[PDB]
C-alpha cells in the first residue's frame, strides 16, 4: 500500500503566483464564450466525424473514430453543454456516443492504454449528465476491455475502472485500479518527483515497438504532459482511495512542475527548457495541471501552508492560457488553444493546437465557472 519516498521541493518564489489577480466571473465567462464560438464553427466543419489529434498550421483535419483522441472532441461538446444547456450539443455528442458504442462492440482500433481517454469524456460524460443507458453500456464494455488487458497516463485510464466498480459493485474493478495506481506511482515517477520517460523496449528480446517513438526530450528529461498526467491523475485517484500518501506525491509532482515554469507560467514541452531555449511550449500540459490542482484543492486541508499558493498558481496559469494562448481567429478548423506539442520526436503536432489541450483548457474554465460534476 506504500508509495516510494519522493523529494518534495518547496515552491520557489511563490509570490510570482500569490501576487496574480484571481480570475473573475466575467473573465472566465468571456473565455468560455470565445471557445464556444470556435466550437460551433467546428460543428459544421467536423459534422459527425472528428478532429485529428493535432492541428496542421493551426487547422484540424477531419477523421473517423479510430484514434486515441476522439473522446476529447465529444468532451468539448459536453463541457459546452454544461455551460449553455443547448440540446444541439447534446444531440451531436450523443451521436458520438453511439459511434463509441459501435467502436467498442466491433473492437475497432482499440489499444487498452487509450480506453479511459476515449470513453470517459464521451460516454461516461453523458451518463453523468443525463444517465443515458447506451452511454453506460459503452463505458462498462470499455472497462471490461481494460480488465482483460506501465505509463503515467494510466493514472487517468484507471478512472474508468473506478467508475465501473461504482456502477456494478464488483470489487475486481477496484482491485485492478488500486493495484495499477501503486504500480504506476512507484515505477513511473522518479525519486525527485519528475515523471520517468523512456523509449520502451521488449523486456525479453529488446525489440522496440514501432511506429511510435519516445515521449520527452531524453531519458534524463522531464516531459511536461507526463508531469501533468501525474498532477491530474493523482487527485483523481485520491478521490477513490483516500491514501494521504497520494497528497504528498501530488505536492512533489506539482511543486516540481511549478518550479520549472517560465516567466508567463506556461510550461515548455519538456521541463528542462525555459525562457531563451527557443523550444516550443506545450499548453496542453499546463491546461491539464490546472485541472489537477483544481481537483486536489477540493480535498487539501486548509492547514496546508501551500494551499493558497496552489490556488493562486492555477489562477496564474489559467489566466496566462486565456490571455496569451487561447485562439482569436474564428475560422473553421481552428483549435481552442494554440502552441501545444503532440510528439516532438516524431515531428507530429509540434507547436500546434491539439484536442486534449482544447478539452483540458475548456475543462479548467468550466471547473472555475461552475460546480462541475466530474466525467472522470
Swiss-Prot record:
Reactions this protein catalyses: beta-D-4-deoxy-Delta(4)-GlcpA-(1->3)-beta-D-GalpNAc6S + H2O = N-acetyl-beta-D-galactosamine 6-sulfate + 5-dehydro-4-deoxy-D-glucuronate
Q: Which residues form a coiled coil?
A: none
Q: Which GO terms describe its molecular function?
A: chondroitin hydrolase activity; unsaturated chondroitin disaccharide hydrolase activity
Describe how expression is induced or repressed: Constitutively expressed. Expression level increases in the presence of glycosaminoglycan.
Q: Which residues span the membrane?
A: none
**Class of enzymatic activity (EC top level):** hydrolase
* InterPro entries assigned: 6-hairpin_glycosidase_sf (IPR008928), 6hp_glycosidase-like_sf (IPR012341), Glyco_hydro_88 (IPR010905), UG_Glycosaminoglycan_Hydrolase (IPR052369)
Q: What is the effect of changing residue 346 to G?
A: Affects preference for sulfated glycosaminoglycans compared to sulfated glycosaminoglycans
Q: Which residues bind substrate?
A: 114, 153, 211, 213, 225, 229, 343, 346
Q: What is its EC number?
A: 3.2.1.180
Task: Tell me the outcome of changing residue 348 to I.
Answer: Prefers unsulfated glycosaminoglycans compared to sulfated glycosaminoglycans
Query: Which SUPFAM superfamilies does the annotation name?
Result: Six-hairpin glycosidases
| Keyword annotations of the record | Carbohydrate metabolism, Glycosidase, Hydrolase, Polysaccharide degradation, Virulence
What are the BP-aspect GO terms? Answer: polysaccharide catabolic process
The record's active-site residues are 114, 153
Give the top-rank taxon of the lineage listed in the UniProt record for this protein. Answer: Bacteria
Miscellaneous remark of the record: Ser-343 and Ser-346 bind the sulfated group in the substrate and determine the preference for sulfated glycosaminoglycans compared to unsulfated glycosaminoglycans.
Q: Which family is this protein grouped under? A: Belongs to the glycosyl hydrolase 88 family.
Q: What does this protein do?
A: Catalyzes the hydrolysis of unsaturated hyaluronate and chondroitin disaccharides. Also degrades unsaturated heparin disaccharides. Releases 4-deoxy-4,5-didehydro D-glucuronic acid or 4-deoxy-4,5-didehydro L-iduronic acid from chondroitin disaccharides, hyaluronan disaccharides and heparin disaccharides and cleaves both glycosidic (1->3) and (1->4) bonds. Prefers sulfated glycosaminoglycans compared to unsulfated glycosaminoglycans. Probably required for mammalian cells invasion through the degradation of extracellular sulfated glycosaminoglycans such as chondroitin and hyaluronan.
What PANTHER family does this protein's entry cite? HYDROLASE, PUTATIVE (AFU_ORTHOLOGUE AFUA_7G05090)-RELATED
Describe the protein's quaternary organization and the partners it interacts with.
Monomer.
Q: What is this protein called?
A: Unsaturated chondroitin disaccharide hydrolase
